[PDB]
Nucleic acid binder design. Structure first.
Ligand SMILES: [Mg+2]
Ligand SMILES: [Mg+2]
Ligand SMILES: [Mg+2]
Ligand SMILES: [Mg+2]
Ligand SMILES: [Mg+2]
Ligand SMILES: [Mg+2]
Ligand SMILES: [Mg+2]
Ligand SMILES: [Mg+2]
Ligand SMILES: [Mg+2]
Ligand SMILES: [Mg+2]
Ligand SMILES: [Mg+2]
Ligand SMILES: [Mg+2]
Ligand SMILES: [Mg+2]
Ligand SMILES: [Mg+2]
Ligand SMILES: [Mg+2]
Ligand SMILES: [Mg+2]
Ligand SMILES: [Mg+2]
Ligand SMILES: [Mg+2]
Ligand SMILES: [Mg+2]
Ligand SMILES: [Mg+2]
Ligand SMILES: [Mg+2]
Ligand SMILES: [Mg+2]
Ligand SMILES: [Mg+2]
Ligand SMILES: [Mg+2]
Ligand SMILES: [Mg+2]
Ligand SMILES: [Mg+2]
Ligand SMILES: [Mg+2]
Ligand SMILES: [Mg+2]
Ligand SMILES: [Mg+2]
Ligand SMILES: [Mg+2]
Ligand SMILES: [Mg+2]
Ligand SMILES: [Mg+2]
Ligand SMILES: [Mg+2]
Ligand SMILES: [Mg+2]
Ligand SMILES: [Mg+2]
Ligand SMILES: [Mg+2]
Ligand SMILES: [Mg+2]
Ligand SMILES: [Mg+2]
Ligand SMILES: [Mg+2]
Ligand SMILES: [Mg+2]
Ligand SMILES: [Mg+2]
Ligand SMILES: [Mg+2]
Ligand SMILES: [Mg+2]
Ligand SMILES: [Mg+2]
Ligand SMILES: [Mg+2]
Ligand SMILES: [Mg+2]
Ligand SMILES: [Mg+2]
Ligand SMILES: [Mg+2]
Ligand SMILES: [Mg+2]
Ligand SMILES: [Mg+2]
Ligand SMILES: [Mg+2]
Ligand SMILES: [Mg+2]
Ligand SMILES: [Mg+2]
Ligand SMILES: [Mg+2]
Ligand SMILES: [Mg+2]
Ligand SMILES: [Mg+2]
Ligand SMILES: [Mg+2]
Ligand SMILES: [Mg+2]
Ligand SMILES: [Mg+2]
Ligand SMILES: [Mg+2]
Ligand SMILES: [Mg+2]
Ligand SMILES: [Mg+2]
Ligand SMILES: [Mg+2]
Ligand SMILES: [Mg+2]
Ligand SMILES: [Mg+2]
Ligand SMILES: [Mg+2]
Ligand SMILES: [Mg+2]
Ligand SMILES: [Mg+2]
Ligand SMILES: [Mg+2]
Ligand SMILES: [Mg+2]
Ligand SMILES: [Mg+2]
Ligand SMILES: [Mg+2]
Ligand SMILES: [Mg+2]
Ligand SMILES: [Mg+2]
Ligand SMILES: [Mg+2]
Ligand SMILES: [Mg+2]
Ligand SMILES: [Mg+2]
Ligand SMILES: [Mg+2]
Ligand SMILES: [Mg+2]
Ligand SMILES: [Mg+2]
Ligand SMILES: [Mg+2]
Ligand SMILES: [Mg+2]
Ligand SMILES: [Mg+2]
Ligand SMILES: [Mg+2]
Ligand SMILES: [Mg+2]
Ligand SMILES: [Mg+2]
Ligand SMILES: [Mg+2]
Ligand SMILES: [Mg+2]
Ligand SMILES: [Mg+2]
Ligand SMILES: [Mg+2]
Ligand SMILES: [Mg+2]
Ligand SMILES: [Mg+2]
Ligand SMILES: [Mg+2]
Ligand SMILES: [Mg+2]
Ligand SMILES: [Mg+2]
Ligand SMILES: [Mg+2]
Ligand SMILES: [Mg+2]
Ligand SMILES: [Mg+2]
Ligand SMILES: [Mg+2]
Ligand SMILES: [Mg+2]
Ligand SMILES: [Mg+2]
Ligand SMILES: [Mg+2]
Ligand SMILES: [Mg+2]
Ligand SMILES: [Mg+2]
Ligand SMILES: [Mg+2]
Ligand SMILES: [Mg+2]
Ligand SMILES: [Mg+2]
Ligand SMILES: [Mg+2]
Ligand SMILES: [Mg+2]
Ligand SMILES: [Mg+2]
Ligand SMILES: [Mg+2]
Ligand SMILES: [Mg+2]
Ligand SMILES: [Mg+2]
Ligand SMILES: [Mg+2]
Ligand SMILES: [Mg+2]
Ligand SMILES: [Mg+2]
Ligand SMILES: [Mg+2]
Ligand SMILES: [Mg+2]
Ligand SMILES: [Mg+2]
Ligand SMILES: [Mg+2]
Ligand SMILES: [Mg+2]
Ligand SMILES: [Mg+2]
Ligand SMILES: [Mg+2]
Ligand SMILES: [Mg+2]
Ligand SMILES: [Mg+2]
Ligand SMILES: [Mg+2]
Ligand SMILES: [Mg+2]
Ligand SMILES: [Mg+2]
Ligand SMILES: [Mg+2]
Ligand SMILES: [Mg+2]
Ligand SMILES: [Mg+2]
Ligand SMILES: [Mg+2]
Ligand SMILES: [Mg+2]
Ligand SMILES: [Mg+2]
Ligand SMILES: [Mg+2]
Ligand SMILES: [Mg+2]
Ligand SMILES: [Mg+2]
Ligand SMILES: [Mg+2]
Ligand SMILES: [Mg+2]
Ligand SMILES: [Mg+2]
Ligand SMILES: [Mg+2]
Ligand SMILES: [Mg+2]
Ligand SMILES: [Mg+2]
Ligand SMILES: [Mg+2]
Ligand SMILES: [Mg+2]
Ligand SMILES: [Mg+2]
Ligand SMILES: [Mg+2]
Ligand SMILES: [Mg+2]
Ligand SMILES: [Mg+2]
Ligand SMILES: [Mg+2]
Ligand SMILES: [Mg+2]
Ligand SMILES: [Mg+2]
Ligand SMILES: [Mg+2]
Ligand SMILES: [Mg+2]
Ligand SMILES: [Mg+2]
Ligand SMILES: [Mg+2]
Ligand SMILES: [Mg+2]
Ligand SMILES: [Mg+2]
Ligand SMILES: [Mg+2]
Ligand SMILES: [Mg+2]
Ligand SMILES: [Mg+2]
Ligand SMILES: [Mg+2]
Lengths: 47, 273
RNA sequence: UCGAUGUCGGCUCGUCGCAUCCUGGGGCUGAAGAAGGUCCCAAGGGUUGGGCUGUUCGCCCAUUAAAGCGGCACGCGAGCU
RNA sequence: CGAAUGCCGGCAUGAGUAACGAUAAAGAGGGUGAGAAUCCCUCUCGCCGUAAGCCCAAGGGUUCCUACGCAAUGGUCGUCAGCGUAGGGUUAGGCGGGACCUAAGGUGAAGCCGAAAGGCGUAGCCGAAGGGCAGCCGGUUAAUAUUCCGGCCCUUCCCGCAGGUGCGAUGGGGGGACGCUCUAGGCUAGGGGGACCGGAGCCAUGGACGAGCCCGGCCAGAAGCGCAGGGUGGGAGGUAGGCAAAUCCGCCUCCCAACAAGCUCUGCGUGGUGGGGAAGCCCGUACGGGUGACAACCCCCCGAAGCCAGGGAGCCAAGAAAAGCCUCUAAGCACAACCUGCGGGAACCCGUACCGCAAACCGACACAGGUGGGCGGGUGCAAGAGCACUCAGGCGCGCGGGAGAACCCUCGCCAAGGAACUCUGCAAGUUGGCCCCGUAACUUCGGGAGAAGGGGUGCUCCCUGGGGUGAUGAGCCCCGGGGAGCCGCAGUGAACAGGCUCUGGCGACUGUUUACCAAAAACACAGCUCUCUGCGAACUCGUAAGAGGAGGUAUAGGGAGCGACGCUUGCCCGGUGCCGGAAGGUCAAGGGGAGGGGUGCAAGCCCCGAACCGAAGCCCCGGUGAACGGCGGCCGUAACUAUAACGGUCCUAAGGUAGCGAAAUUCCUUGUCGGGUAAGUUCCGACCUGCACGAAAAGCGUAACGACCGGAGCGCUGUCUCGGCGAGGGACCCGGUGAAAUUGAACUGGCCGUGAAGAUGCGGCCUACCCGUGGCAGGACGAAAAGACCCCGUGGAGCUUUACUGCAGC
RNA sequence: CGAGCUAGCCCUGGCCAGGGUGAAGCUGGGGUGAGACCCAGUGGAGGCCCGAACCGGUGGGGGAUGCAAACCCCUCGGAUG
RNA sequence: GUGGUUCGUGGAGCCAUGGGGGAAUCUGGGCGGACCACCGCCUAAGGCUAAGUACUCCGGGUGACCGAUAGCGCACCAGUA
RNA sequence: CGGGGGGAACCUGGGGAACUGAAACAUCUCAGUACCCAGAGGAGAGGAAAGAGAAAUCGACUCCCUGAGUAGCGGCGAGCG
RNA sequence: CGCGGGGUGGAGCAGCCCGGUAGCUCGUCGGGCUCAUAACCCGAAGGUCGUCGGUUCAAAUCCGGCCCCCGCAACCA
RNA sequence: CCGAGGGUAGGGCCCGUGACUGGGGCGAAGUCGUAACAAGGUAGCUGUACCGGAAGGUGCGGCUGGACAC
RNA sequence: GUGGGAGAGGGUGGUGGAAUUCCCGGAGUAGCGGUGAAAUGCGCAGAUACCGGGAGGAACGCCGAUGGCGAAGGCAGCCACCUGGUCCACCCGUGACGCUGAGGCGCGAAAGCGUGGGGAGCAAACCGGAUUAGAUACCCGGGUAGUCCACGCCCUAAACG
């Protein structure tokens, strides 16, 4: 039965993308947190 | 007037359709159309600010002329009468002799062969448009400017009209479709006659779906909700209103008058009994 | 017994008690006979099908030798409904 | 540290137990190899075939091809693989996207708003499965190909030559450019047939050397031409409109064509040319290669939902945009420029493997689930994408071998009976397609209707009608009609196809719903009523700007109730709500300064402060019921009796009208009577004593409708009397692999007692050799879940109001 | 931080085998003073009918450490709105 | 009307200021806790100013600090799988 | 010429909770904490008296000790200070 | 069992709260108007206040027990 | 082949009958009132509509078969 | 036929004044209404009575009759348009072409019904005041449908001479 993950490459980068994060002050601090944590990827990697 | 149907389905039983024989033209005048929103009843916040709207046939917006006075004294011929699906009434196509084409709300009795003009010059005749000050008292008239040069806001709906009851100073007294008596400025353009397609009110939608086609989605009553949703929500099965009947937002919906008390517009109104 | 002892009724499977419904054996009778009444012994076996209602009860139909009353977590849901 | 359903880890028990993931199915021979049910090859058998085949998009990301491997992954095995190592492999001016357009929306010079972060916003920009745009057929690789190659076509840019023209745009105009249903003519895709054409070869087992059987009989292709369609008038004058200007477009007039006439564009056909090209046989293939062949390469028929396409008609709910393109002019330039034709040159980036209804995507799994577009052949059955079988192609579902117990599942059949089963015909049966006859109450005249109930149904021969194609003909294809006969238990001979009637309740109807225990009598619904709202509307969202409402305007819009339709919808305005009321009462800040006070020597400075003027609100006066709501009590009375039309009296704002009524409502209740039944707590019809119906939280009805809920009959049955047999998949046995909750430890019997009140564990007595397998559930107060019920906690949350208090709003 | 599930709306596309019923209108004939209307043919309407795909999820059985954290079988509802 | 201070309206000054009114320039003005007098303090409505202060990504030194279930989440290719 | 963005914690400013405490709770508390935003910098803030406040006194600011859990504040409650 | 209200001339209601005094309508009785009846007019009679205790000087009135009547309630189970 | 009848199924008419229910007829002395016949004490009657224990009342319109004073 | 006439005959569209009602302005005070008598109602929040302004609906005084017209029902301010019946004079045409009329068709007062409008006065129902033994009546104060228009039904009558 249809489940929750219906991957679509444009939906991901439009939503969690790096330009998404930078546009909203909420999202900049996302990056800030993940960068301060040392996350290897600050943002979903979609191909 | 008002096509009926044999009941070869339920609801084709009581359904009733407009008589379209007034209509002389089907495709609208491409120069004169624009596309629509349409809003689903949602404002720029994405939020529904008007409940129970959506769906409904796609529509092209006929641009229509509510200032007749930019064209003063230039006559025009009535080319066609067609369906505007944004409004209760019908649109008349006017070829002016400038060669400019515009759409007008089609008054009751307007024929397409005929000539119409706007200005104080203006024979008092169906379709012509004048400053209110130059219409003879007792005339019935439609598409009225409420303030001068601001466009026609009054009596535009299928079958509506207003009468001139008299003049006082720079102002003239009108009886609006509501029956409010209010002063309108004499300088306000109006166009003699009633609106027509007045048979409009006897259409009988006849089945739910026909209501959808008009973009009206189902309407659910407060009684059918729960207390979170609505002052009428809850109870065990059925229930009187249990309080003075209210809107979902909580104000009383029987008799409570919402018009602002102090509006300057109040100096110009005498009525509505 | 609340860090759970699943509740009515039905179905299935029973088992026991006897304060015995039938069958067996008795005493008394206001027992002529046949048929009853009443009490005594007796638990071996037996104790119907159906209409109504979720019913248990109960009422009713057609029979019967009889259409017994109780207990078993009002027996029985790691057996079913 | 011994306990915290503690924490982390390790290892146990259950147990060699359940299970090994669709019941589409396997068998043998040969090969390989240390080793083979499982890998490869062949033969046989089975399964899919509107797929379980093929193509595309997503998503996935090397899984692709090949060599070498088998520790692990693979539910067994593995010599194999989507697995390990390594190597290779994805080729574009034309396909997709980008150096094009715009849609929702997004963003946003201007601008507006917001403590800050930010919000909005015209133009513009961005944004596509929409618009625009030039590649078709074949061959080739282990692996890519509209990408390479072959052949034949085309596009843009740049430059040039020639010829033509007032050239020129982001500006004006045209166009692009549009719905749903039905649908004409001509095509094509695809398909069937042929006695005609081409082809290895076959005569079996009784017959057949045959007009036999088997196989095949095409594809792409510029110009030109042909057929079929789309688009479209031409000329002149006037002109004030298309935010400058146009010669364009618009409009008025006049003048010819009236027609696709022509011009133009597209479809199909044909076309120089190029290319494919079966069975079978041979070899040899994970794959395909020789030959067949110098292959043939043709007639007829069926025929799209596709094409011509901006076709046609009808309808109402009235059906994107911008660019390409054309035209018009403005600057500007008229050596320029642009148009047309020819020629040369130039033509970038990204994708391109592979899976793709699934073992490669979403579901933790090689998971019976989910996933959008296209193609989807043949025959038969009325049609069809249905059903059965079958091409191409693809599969036998990654444990097997046996046995033939209980039991379970899924399936077949049954004497007689036929609902007696049971909450209930639950379930299963019956019925079942087409054609013909026929068909009630009632009805809103449509319906009810597939009502009901019947008959027909195959095959053969003879005769005969009309159609489409052709000619008006045969041939082929379609729809029929009549007559005589043949066989069987049976002719919709298999497969896919309603059981029906009577009668209540509720809801008018089709719809909607609690994803994952409720599909309904709930919601919605057309329709009726109330109410607000004059337009910078009310209302809603937002601090605001702004937006929705609406590019709407009272025949509109918002809120509320009621809920098709019929006939209807009574009385009460005391209370509450709302509506009206220019008086009156009260009323806050403020105005007013009577008088009083502090302190100074004082001028003064400072503090109280009565009257009186003073909003809304409340009070007060009215109104208002499809506003919240509410619509009586006791006693008497008629010439049998009973009852009480009548009366008395108390109270009220007013005392329930019509209709209906033991009801989805009736306690007593299985009310009483009648009907159905042999028997009826249900059901239907009545009565009225309505605990506790009643008129838009509408009253009473209503044809039609319903996977709703009740009651009855017929038909028919394994529901039952009442069980029996049979099939398969499991269960059992053997080989491979091998879990789980639970588990204080155990050397874990019965009765009668006792015990914290229900004892394997204490007393007494009885019984009892050790250990298992298959079975059944009575007990271990069995497992599971720190009981949801109940209470407790000055625990929590959702909801309400004439609880308190406050805030938005007004 | 989430509307890649789900709910509504917005923009742009696509899908719905086959069969059945036979509204209005049109045409002809009747009819009349002119009508209404009546019949026939034509036509091809509809939250019309049967039924695949597609969308559902009625009843029952199975499953219940599942194939599956909602599945399978049979049956059944809608299928131009 | 509020905030700040110990100051919750209190006898409530001081400092700050959203609203209304609104001066003067040494004989001017603010303050010493309502207010008045007196005696004092101080010169608002412009600005800058080292150091003594806080902190520890980084480098060092030192522990009656841990010693791979400890010590940072990470002694190990960890903000990884 | 300059700005933009980053920086563990520290700093200033703009804004600013609730659990909790009060053994219920509204004033009060938690707390100008958490957090969000803006700015600094290697620090930041503050700073040279229209100050204190009782002495005819002190003399910018910041930080420590003390004054002192004092003065006070307070449903004069918890508690704040 | 529970809680609230009641029992007063023949009927139906006051009075009880706040002790002393029993009232209203109807009915009944006597008289009148009328041929008569009713209507109508003029007069009258009629009561220990459910009961039994108690309190007080004094009880329909206050308190209690009993008896009736009406109403409400009986939930989770 | 036709065929008396038999059977299964669905209609039509007619009769009897049925809890209960509608009114009607009739019946020496029942209850409530007075609608009508005399201006019947509101002229009556009337088709229709609403209401009401009951006769009847009221509205609209009609008919006369109703009319010496002020 | 021709030439004439009378008429509220019918259908449509206009239009006038009187009056009632409501609203505004003015002025003005303590009652107005109403009946048998009263009361309900209305009125110092300014009623009634008076003057002026405005809105709207219905009906058409005098002429008017003991009249005219129509088949009946019915039809009445004024104007115009369309249109029916009918009478008279001349003796001009047709030549019995007539009369009645089961069925059929049409019209048919009031009230009533449906969908819309409109709603001033009146007014079933309904409320209240009074009368009365009662008064679901008669009188009085209120008052909805209706009365009016359009279209469509109903089709009755002391539809009577
Ligand atoms: Mg789906
Ligand atoms: Mg995509
Ligand atoms: Mg890295
Ligand atoms: Mg947004
Ligand atoms: Mg609506
Ligand atoms: Mg609704
Ligand atoms: Mg609900
Ligand atoms: Mg609420
Ligand atoms: Mg409620
Ligand atoms: Mg409810
Ligand atoms: Mg209820
Ligand atoms: Mg317990
Ligand atoms: Mg517990
Ligand atoms: Mg049981
Ligand atoms: Mg015995
Ligand atoms: Mg004997
Ligand atoms: Mg025995
Ligand atoms: Mg026994
Ligand atoms: Mg039963
Ligand atoms: Mg019983
Ligand atoms: Mg058990
Ligand atoms: Mg159970
Ligand atoms: Mg048990
Ligand atoms: Mg048990
Ligand atoms: Mg311990
Ligand atoms: Mg446990
Ligand atoms: Mg432990
Ligand atoms: Mg083991
Ligand atoms: Mg075991
Ligand atoms: Mg086993
Ligand atoms: Mg097994
Ligand atoms: Mg398997
Ligand atoms: Mg296998
Ligand atoms: Mg096939
Ligand atoms: Mg291996
Ligand atoms: Mg596996
Ligand atoms: Mg190429
Ligand atoms: Mg190419
Ligand atoms: Mg491209
Ligand atoms: Mg370029
Ligand atoms: Mg663009
Ligand atoms: Mg763009
Ligand atoms: Mg924005
Ligand atoms: Mg901004
Ligand atoms: Mg773009
Ligand atoms: Mg595109
Ligand atoms: Mg495209
Ligand atoms: Mg292209
Ligand atoms: Mg190719
Ligand atoms: Mg040009
Ligand atoms: Mg389009
Ligand atoms: Mg072709
Ligand atoms: Mg042979
Ligand atoms: Mg053909
Ligand atoms: Mg077209
Ligand atoms: Mg349509
Ligand atoms: Mg553009
Ligand atoms: Mg120039
Ligand atoms: Mg490729
Ligand atoms: Mg695969
Ligand atoms: Mg599938
Ligand atoms: Mg597919
Ligand atoms: Mg597998
Ligand atoms: Mg799968
Ligand atoms: Mg699918
Ligand atoms: Mg078929
Ligand atoms: Mg097959
Ligand atoms: Mg094959
Ligand atoms: Mg057999
Ligand atoms: Mg049998
Ligand atoms: Mg039978
Ligand atoms: Mg039943
Ligand atoms: Mg069934
Ligand atoms: Mg019948
Ligand atoms: Mg049949
Ligand atoms: Mg045969
Ligand atoms: Mg069959
Ligand atoms: Mg069948
Ligand atoms: Mg069927
Ligand atoms: Mg019932
Ligand atoms: Mg329904
Ligand atoms: Mg449907
Ligand atoms: Mg619902
Ligand atoms: Mg559900
Ligand atoms: Mg749920
Ligand atoms: Mg769920
Ligand atoms: Mg349903
Ligand atoms: Mg209705
Ligand atoms: Mg707001
Ligand atoms: Mg708009
Ligand atoms: Mg409802
Ligand atoms: Mg009231
Ligand atoms: Mg009120
Ligand atoms: Mg009142
Ligand atoms: Mg003074
Ligand atoms: Mg006031
Ligand atoms: Mg009512
Ligand atoms: Mg009543
Ligand atoms: Mg009853
Ligand atoms: Mg009964
Ligand atoms: Mg009841
Ligand atoms: Mg029942
Ligand atoms: Mg009944
Ligand atoms: Mg009810
Ligand atoms: Mg109601
Ligand atoms: Mg009913
Ligand atoms: Mg019904
Ligand atoms: Mg349905
Ligand atoms: Mg249903
Ligand atoms: Mg059986
Ligand atoms: Mg077997
Ligand atoms: Mg032992
Ligand atoms: Mg024991
Ligand atoms: Mg022991
Ligand atoms: Mg057991
Ligand atoms: Mg347990
Ligand atoms: Mg408490
Ligand atoms: Mg609490
Ligand atoms: Mg979604
Ligand atoms: Mg969505
Ligand atoms: Mg079809
Ligand atoms: Mg059809
Ligand atoms: Mg349908
Ligand atoms: Mg169907
Ligand atoms: Mg299901
Ligand atoms: Mg089940
Ligand atoms: Mg089970
Ligand atoms: Mg649609
Ligand atoms: Mg303060
Ligand atoms: Mg205080
Ligand atoms: Mg203070
Ligand atoms: Mg001071
Ligand atoms: Mg001074
Ligand atoms: Mg100061
Ligand atoms: Mg000081
Ligand atoms: Mg002082
Ligand atoms: Mg100082
Ligand atoms: Mg200074
Ligand atoms: Mg050490
Ligand atoms: Mg370690
Ligand atoms: Mg560690
Ligand atoms: Mg170690
Ligand atoms: Mg760690
Ligand atoms: Mg701050
Ligand atoms: Mg607390
Ligand atoms: Mg506490
Ligand atoms: Mg609490
Ligand atoms: Mg604080
Ligand atoms: Mg701060
Ligand atoms: Mg330094
Ligand atoms: Mg510093
Ligand atoms: Mg420093
Ligand atoms: Mg500073
Ligand atoms: Mg409760
Ligand atoms: Mg009378
Ligand atoms: Mg009389
Ligand atoms: Mg009389
Ligand atoms: Mg009356
Ligand atoms: Mg005649
Ligand atoms: Mg009539
Ligand atoms: Mg009438
Ligand atoms: Mg009288």
């Amino acid at each position: 039965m249809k489940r929750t993950w219906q991957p679509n490459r444009r939906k991901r980068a439009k939503t969690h993308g790096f330009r998404a994060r930078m546009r909203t002050p909420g999202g900049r601090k996302v990056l800030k947190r993940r960068r301060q944590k040392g996350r290897w990827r600050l943002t979903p990697a979609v191909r | 007037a008002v096509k009926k149907f044999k009941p070869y389905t339920p609801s084709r039983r009581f359904m009733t359709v407009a008589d379209f024989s007034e209509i002389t033209k089907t495709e609208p005048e491409k120069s004169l159309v624009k596309p629509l929103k349409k809003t689903g009843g949602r404002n720029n916040q994405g939020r529904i600010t008007v409940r129970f709207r959506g769906g409904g046939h796609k529509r092209l917006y006929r641009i229509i002329d509510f200032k007749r006075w930019d064209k003063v004294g230039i006559p025009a011929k009535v080319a066609a009468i067609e369906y505007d699906p944004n409004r209760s009434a019908r649109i008349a196509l006017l070829h002016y002799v400038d060669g400019e084409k515009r759409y007008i709300i089609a008054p009751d009795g307007l024929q397409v062969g005929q000539q119409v003009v706007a200005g104080p010059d203006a024979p008092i005749q169906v379709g012509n448009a004048l400053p209110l000050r130059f219409i003879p008292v007792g005339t019935v008239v439609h598409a009225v400017e409420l303030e001068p040069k601001k466009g026609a806001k009054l009596a535009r709906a299928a079958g509506t009209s207003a009468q001139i009851q008299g003049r006082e100073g720079d102002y003239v007294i009108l009886r609006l479709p509501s029956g409010e008596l209010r002063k309108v400025h004499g300088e306000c353009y109006a166009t003699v006659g009633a609106v027509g397609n007045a048979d409009h009110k006897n259409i009988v939608l006849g089945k739910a779906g026909r209501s959808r086609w008009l973009g009206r989605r189902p309407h659910v009553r407060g009684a059918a909700m729960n207390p979170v949703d609505h002052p009428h929500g809850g109870g065990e099965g059925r229930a009187p209103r249990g309080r003075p009947p209210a809107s979902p937002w909580g104000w009383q919906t029987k008799g409570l008058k919402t018009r602002k008390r102090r509006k300057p517009s109040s100096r110009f109104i005498i009525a509505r009994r």
